Write an enzyme that holds these catalytic residues in place. Structure first.
Site, PDB file in Angstrom:
ATOM      1  CG  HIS B 157      -2.158  -0.764   0.978  1.00  0.00           C
ATOM      2  ND1 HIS B 157      -2.045  -2.115   1.570  1.00  0.00           N
ATOM      3  CD2 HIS B 157      -3.382  -0.374   0.478  1.00  0.00           C
ATOM      4  CE1 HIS B 157      -3.425  -2.643   1.345  1.00  0.00           C
ATOM      5  NE2 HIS B 157      -4.071  -1.920   0.564  1.00  0.00           N
ATOM      6  CE  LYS B 161      -4.536   0.267   4.283  1.00  0.00           C
ATOM      7  NZ  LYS B 161      -5.602   0.774   4.655  1.00  0.00           N
TER       8      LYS B 161
END
Lengths: 260, 260, 260, 260
Positions: B157, B161
């Site tokens: 990600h 995040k």
């Protein structure tokens, strides 16, 4: 030595030794001239290729002097202590030596340096051509991608592997940190210094996958090495044997590959 | 409703809302009939497609009653509080609702259940068709590969995040642990129960990559989802709108996809 | 047979045979009781594990009747003709048989069917647990992703491989085409039937990588099998031996895995 | 120009133009000073950032002279004809120009060369930092892996892409063939010249993935570029604008990146 180069393999019955026999067999400029084991090996007297489908004509032997007398180069991926006995005999017999054995401390390394005055040696922590090439290109990549990128060293290994991150992964890290002018261990904007992290997968019997991922907004660059078997180290060791033919001195895989 | 289905989009100026406008545009059985924003939005009065290159003829509006009066289904990926006001109006106007909004607690979920007696609802934690399919196939995979495999949930990600592992990764874990008869959080032989672990990459602006790796001696099976943009959730939300047409009740994406 | 199951291996000196010896060694419910070769093999009289580091106590033999007399199951990945001689003897001795040999035509398949009335047989085109699981999950995936996706079967194999696409890739294709209600061989919108294509990489000594890629706007789903060695087929063959213990009949890997 | 550098964007309402507005916004040494469109654009008078969530204060304009008068550099990824009109005005106003426009023939290229005597230009077929870095490292990789490897250029693109292989893939091929001393278009042993091939995936809406795979017995090296959006080209174009500040002359991305 004249071509074909006469190669002797230490630890011929171990995992590296078998693959080395195959590597010598595959390379057209080399032939197998000796295959060494210690006096307790169940494989003494067997053909060096018995476990890999080849008829080499070379009986696995414990006669180190006899084998070295008829060889041009010894390839050794065994343990430090037996390697350094083999070293002394290579010096005496004027045989080159490719040392893939790892785990030497300062006094072992000094012994290798000294013998390199008298014979040709290639001594490298890793004999994979692809790995060493990766270490070299990572310097360039990290210099260019020095700002704005998140850098991740991702590795996959077999379940029971003890060291995390692997030595290869740590080296990839040291090359990158070095290229960034840093020492090893939010949003990264376009002028922020690029950052480094490590991720580790331990699973199954994975021989070893290493990826350096450089990521920014809109792009990923991935530099990946995948080892399918020990043949990668063996093939690089045989390339090194061929390269160091006719030379005296201490060399490494950067030399073999014509890098730096 | 008759085809084409008249779709209204809540939060039409947000990131999900824009992609939803495009998703309604791409699907041949749907048309955009409303686009809602709150009274402070800088985008009131603009065409719903102004930021995605489409001329929809639909002015972004804050008139919830007027929009719902001329729509068959509302798609809502906003916040719990405004979603539940929209819910009450869908009930009143007999409009179906696709709830992609997350973060409801027990009382919000009870409100959704109650309204499902009176209108058609699809309420799912994730609207990606591929993700939900992955959750389904992982049950099967893990049942068959229940002994002898090391299982790793690997996810990539964007840098900033907050949650590691992601909610998707945790769900993949819960499905697998469940299939193995276990609760979530050496060499694995052929009759040893398969093991589970997690690895996380945080880098650049990666929308989201999720891999379940099942590894044993000699093989890897990898089940992978790669999100290129929010269109994956939007396209699944529009599929759900089309599916729930003509129905009353509380459904989820397993229903939409004809699974279980 | 009682546990441990006594396994005999045909073609014990071939590539599949060696890995089978290791597979029998790794599985705790099995032991090696015989290892067969033809009368010309250079390996007659050697220990079955001589090339894989194991002391099995089993001399590689050409005495088919003697070996079968002391075994519960024969595993055979050899050639059709010798396999069918072994078959007749398994029938006679009441020994089960795992047939990994491929290349039978209609009359060979009829012979296998007939013998399955009298002994337990598992006969499969592929013994990899992961591959067979992939073929099963692909049916589900393709049914759900039946509209709107571009489907690509991507495979990597060693340089000199003759068949492109591989048999595994063609099977993956047939499963997918079947799930789409089609026969094998612009922009795909959300209601357009999903399309199928093949891509092939021939390089190095890659044992075999197979990926089914399902792609649409905003997402990719990838179902991947990676073979690291022949151990994947061998381990699945030994699982099948254990599974078919105590049974008479013709079975395949879908049966072994509890699928369909 | 002084920092911050005042950047003007041509084709500000196109796909590249929007991402360029975001790229100028993200880079701390740049500010947006103009945003050009032709007189028919529906977006004249709108804020340059209207479709990407930014309030730039810059109205999209068709007044080329006015915009250039208050800018230091124009970034142009439009079409050859309008780009060359913009060029003449940059020359006149002493504004630098980053030409990402492609499709010039010999006379367009001569025009660019001539103007580079009078202003700073960076003119590159590709502005992705990662892609250009890949082209550079591939020369090194291919020189070292010049014997014994099978080389495959693998690319993934969106379904309706017309050119296969892509221009990037063809360039990767030309760099590799060049490094091997060859012109573009069985088992490869350790002294055999390394071979080149291409594989193409057309599927979904893949922005573009390019992999150069070098494979031999026991190893794979993969050099991979993954584009997540057009931001990769835009970010490299803004890096080039910053780099060429204070210079006159014709430069390319190899110059920007400090390569060769």
């Amino acid at each position: 030595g004249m071509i074909p180069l006469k190669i002797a393999i230490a630890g011929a019955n171990g995992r590296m030794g078998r693959v080395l026999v195959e590597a010598v067999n595959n390379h057209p400029d080399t032939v197998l001239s000796g295959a060494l084991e210690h006096s307790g090996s169940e494989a003494l007297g067997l053909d060096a290729g018995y476990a890999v489908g080849l008829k080499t004509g070379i009986a696995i032997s414990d006669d180190v002097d006899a084998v070295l007398a008829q060889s041009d180069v010894l390839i050794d991926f065994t343990r430090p202590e037996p390697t350094l006995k083999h070293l002394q005999k290579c010096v005496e017999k004027q045989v080159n030596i490719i040392i893939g054995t790892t785990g030497f401390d300062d006094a072992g390394k000094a012994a290798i340096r000294a013998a390199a005055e008298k014979t040709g040696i290639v001594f490298a922590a890793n004999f994979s051509v692809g790995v060493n090439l990766t270490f070299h290109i990572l310097d360039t990549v990290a210099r260019v991608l020095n700002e704005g990128y998140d850098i991740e060293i991702i590795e996959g290994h077999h379940r029971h592997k003890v060291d995390a991150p692997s030595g290869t992964a740590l080296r990839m890290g040291e090359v990158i940190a070095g290229a960034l002018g840093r020492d090893l261990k939010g949003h990264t904007g376009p002028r922020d210094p690029s950052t480094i992290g490590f991720a580790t997968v331990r699973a199954g019997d994975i021989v070893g996958d290493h990826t350096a991922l450089f990521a920014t907004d809109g792009e990923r660059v991935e530099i990946t090495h995948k080892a399918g078997s020990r043949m990668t180290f063996a093939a690089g060791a045989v390339r090194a044997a061929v390269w160091v033919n006719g030379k005296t001195g201490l060399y490494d895989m950067q030399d073999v590959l014509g890098l730096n």
